[PDB]
Design a protein around this ligand. Sequence first.
Ligand SMILES: Cn1cc(CNCC2CCN(c3ncc(C(=O)NO)cn3)CC2)c2ccccc21
Ligand SMILES: [K+]
Ligand SMILES: [K+]
Ligand SMILES: [Zn+2]
Length: 404
Amino acid sequence: SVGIVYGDQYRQLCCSSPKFGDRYALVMDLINAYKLIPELSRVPPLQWDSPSRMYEAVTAFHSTEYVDALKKLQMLHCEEKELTADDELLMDSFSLNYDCPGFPSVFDYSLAAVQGSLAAASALICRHCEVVINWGGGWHHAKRSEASGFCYLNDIVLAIHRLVSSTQTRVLYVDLDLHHGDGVEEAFWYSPRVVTFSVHHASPGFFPGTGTWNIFLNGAGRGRFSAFNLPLEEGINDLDWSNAIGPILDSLNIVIQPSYVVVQCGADCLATDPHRIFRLTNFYPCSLSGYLYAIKKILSWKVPTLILGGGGYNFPDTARLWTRVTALTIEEVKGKKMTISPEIPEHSYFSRYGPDFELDIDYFPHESHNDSIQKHHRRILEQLRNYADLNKLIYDYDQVYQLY
Ligand SMILES: Cn1cc(CNCC2CCN(c3ncc(C(=O)NO)cn3)CC2)c2ccccc21
Ligand SMILES: [K+]
Ligand SMILES: [K+]
Ligand SMILES: [Zn+2]
């Protein structure tokens, strides 16, 4: 089946942060309003038998001292008194500040995404679902002992760790967010069994700064050549982004033959995101949403797949996109046509979709603002060949080369 992570408490926690407000509720209620929930298997977020078991799961990636500090940060924000200077310094040492501040549910909020993505991984491993969706996860920036980019715990790294440790198992990670998936790339820098691929904007001063010329670094030790990046200029439209990523995705699948795919589907590439860097849409025809193009291509491989959320700061338009991703996933997995009215159906959050209440985002596409892509394709092809040689994988050089 196709699974999707949700639950009443999960919803409450995913809506408890100051940065993302009620975004997750709009997403799930739009999916519900389009009558997709009966098509999907509800995957309950993972809960544990003890604090010790919870700590063991989270510290599979994060340090105990970071988890301790994150939990203390929540406690401190549930009291009225200011932090002590010593406690401010402690939080600063884990970057729990400015961009990743405390709030009264910061630990339960961050943990909830881990709970959802670990449960989603398990549903794939046991074969209950062929694809699982978690629109409350996808927090790709968090590091072993560091919060970053509004991300406190890296549910993606933990989910991937659970997948690769199941039964050689290789995972392909595809990061469609506007920003470079640095936390996941770093976690698996030395691992050839998790190949990471991020497409993103990069430019001077733009967060987080990595995923671009440094030459291109691409892994180390036995993980050399296993970290792939495609930085793209601002203004790119659906078609040019699709043509940029398409052959790379196909060639990665052919060469790596992954046991699982994990996709991060951050919605901040939309033309209507307040970032306004890329000009992608959620259109499903004559522009085809780059997101929908990529997901359809990944799902055509018939590999068990985890689809995660991420960025997306225009909440109604993030719901508009992820509702279409969810419908496409049902259609591709079950072979069952999903017809979606171009008109937003009545439901709790209908007023948020004004003034015109249509499923398409309110945007009029045109040509990209910007040869460079061809150089990147040559570089990535060479890196893939290097990866395959280092890891003794066999592959038709010219079937792969002809994809470009
Ligand atoms: C305006 N203003 C600027 C700052 C300093 N930090 C800003 C950067 C902006 C850029 N930034 C950031 N992180 C993640 C994402 C994302 O979507 N990742 O997939 C996007 N953007 C880091 C933080 C700041 C801190 C607190 C309050 C206001 C403040
Ligand atoms: K990305
Ligand atoms: K890697
Ligand atoms: Zn982002």
